[PDB]
Amino acid sequence: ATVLLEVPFSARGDRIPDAVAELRTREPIRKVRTITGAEAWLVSSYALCTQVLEDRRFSMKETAAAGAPRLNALTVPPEVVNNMGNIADAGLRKAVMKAITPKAPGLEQFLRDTANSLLDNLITEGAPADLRNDFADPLATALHCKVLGIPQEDGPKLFRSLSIAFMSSADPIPAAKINWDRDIEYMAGILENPNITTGLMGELSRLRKDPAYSHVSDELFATIGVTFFGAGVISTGSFLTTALISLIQRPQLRNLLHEKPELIPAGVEELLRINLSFADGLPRLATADIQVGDVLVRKGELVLVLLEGANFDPEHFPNPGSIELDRPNPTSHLAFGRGQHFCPGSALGRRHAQIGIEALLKKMPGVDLAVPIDQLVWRTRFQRRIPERLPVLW
Ligand code: HEM
Ligand SMILES: Cc1ccc2cc(N)ccc2n1
Numbered sequence: 265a266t267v268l269l270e271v272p273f274s275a276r277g278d279r280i281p282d283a284v285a286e287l288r289t290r291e292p293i294r295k296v297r298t299i300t301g302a303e304a305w306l307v308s309s310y311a312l313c314t315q316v317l318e319d320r321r322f323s324m325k326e327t328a329a330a331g332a333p334r335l336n337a338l339t340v341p342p343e344v345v346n347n348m349g350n351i352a353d354a355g356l357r358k359a360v361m362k363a364i365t366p367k368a369p370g371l372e373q374f375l376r377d378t379a380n381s382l383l384d385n386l387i388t389e390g391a392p393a394d395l396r397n398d399f400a401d402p403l404a405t406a407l408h409c410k411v412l413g414i415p416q417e418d419g420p421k422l423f424r425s426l427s428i429a430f431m432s433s434a435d436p437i438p439a440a441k442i443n444w445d446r447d448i449e450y451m452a453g454i455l456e457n458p459n460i461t462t463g464l465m466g467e468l469s470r471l472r473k474d475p476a477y478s479h480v481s482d483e484l485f486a487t488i489g490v491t492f493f494g495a496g497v498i499s500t501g502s503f504l505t506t507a508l509i510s511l512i513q514r515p516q517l518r519n520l521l522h523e524k525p526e527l528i529p530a531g532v533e534e535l536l537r538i539n540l541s542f543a544d545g546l547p548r549l550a551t552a553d554i555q556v557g558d559v560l561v562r563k564g565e566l567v568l569v570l571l572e573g574a575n576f577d578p579e580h581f582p583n584p585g586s587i588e589l590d591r592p593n594p595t596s597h598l599a600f601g602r603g604q605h606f607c608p609g610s611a612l613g614r615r616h617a618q619i620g621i622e623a624l625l626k627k628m629p630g631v632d633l634a635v636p637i638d639q640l641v642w643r644t645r646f647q648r649r650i651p652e653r654l655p656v657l658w
């Protein structure tokens with residue numbers, strides 16, 4: 265006897281397992297067991313993934329209900345899974361969205377200046393350099409301090425919560441509550457701090473004292489700061505790190521982007537499409553009985569939308585494992601989701617990766633891995649796939 269197929273399949277972010285294409289062809293929705301022991305429906309074709317993400321009867325918020333089959337344990341309060349919903353209900357969606365666009369005056373120059381300073385410090389120190397810990401993550405942390413309006417020197421301590429906050433664990437994590445409560449107290453202090461007048465926290469601090477928002481809770485305001493810092497920093501640092509691996513492993517493309525930097529936006533869109541940074545399918549709970557392909561998903565069951573299942577589907581992206589800069593459907597991948605919950609940080613995430621890549625290719629045009637690829641250590645039981653260190657020379 266064999267056991268029910270377990271997810272996730274591999275924590276490696278540098279290769280897609282051959283199993284995914286076999287599942288997609290044979291059984292694009294099928295039962296799997298998650299790390300909690302729950303059953304779920306794993307959805308792996310582009311057609312069926314888009315169906316589930318575009319049907320709100322597959323609910324994000326209901327994944328937090330007591331008693332439901334779980335992908336992993338909550339690392340935040342259950343009402344917090346619903347954070348964007350709550351932002352919208354408080355009338356704060358347009359203001360949050362405006363504050364996190366990469367369009368603010370000087371923001372792109374700040375990203376460039378910060379990427380160049382981090383790269384000059386690595387060049388001074390000499391090879392090997394670690395492009396995750398000493399490049400992509402500090403660039404993500406400095407960008408999000410600037411976008412929030414909070415001091416750059418507060419970025420490292422907020423960042424240190426993330427290796428626990430974004431765990432994908434079978435059981436509750438006592439350190440995640442200690443760090444969440446601390447980080448909420450920090451963001452509540454920021455809303456009372458008269459020096460914080462710019463970015464997303466300066467805007468929320470003003471709206472807090474405006475009569476049109478006098479009954480929005482102080483818990484929501486602090487929560488938006490902790491959730492957007494952590495989600496933005498983990499998502500952009502982890503995607504930049506694993507896109508740098510895919511670029512370094514393609515020297516022909518690396519040289520083409522170095523020679524024609526105007527192609528970096530189209531290269532970043534293909535690196536988003538092939539990115540394996542999400543370690544688990546996106547979870548949803550059925551709120552009704554709904555036909556998905558050959559399966560009737562029933563009310564209360566867990567569905568997992570496998571982003572690389574959709575993004576490597578050759579029926580939608582022919583020659584899916586190849587980076588092609590002239591596809592006719594280049595932004596139609598699911599790297600930022602789809603539907604009601606499509607990432608509000610999409611533009612910021614694209615600009616962070618374009619600027620970090622442009623700066624790296626100008627400063628270190630000979631960048632290459634300093635260890636054999638199989639020597640990267642892939643973090644396990646985490647919501648992202650990331651190498652613990654990314655050693656390069658140039
Ligand atoms: C390359 C970088 C990023 C990637 C690949 C990314 C990916 C995603 C994906 C796949 C979703 C959908 C989750 C779902 O439907 O279950 C999402 C949602 C979200 N993202 Fe991003 N993200 C990125 C950057 C950011 C940034 C920069 C921020 C904020 C500063 C951010 C904040 C959020 C929030 C708050 C949600 C939940 C939206 C809702 O529930 O309606 N993300 N992200
Ligand atoms: C439930 C949830 C909430 C916020 C999220 C933010 C992201 N960048 C990615 C996935 C997210 N998922």
Ligand SMILES: Cc1ccc2cc(N)ccc2n1
Nearest residue numbers: 550552553561562563564565
């Ligand atoms: C045997 C079985 C299996 C899964 C079911 C899910 C439901 N929502 C209702 C009845 C069910 N019955």
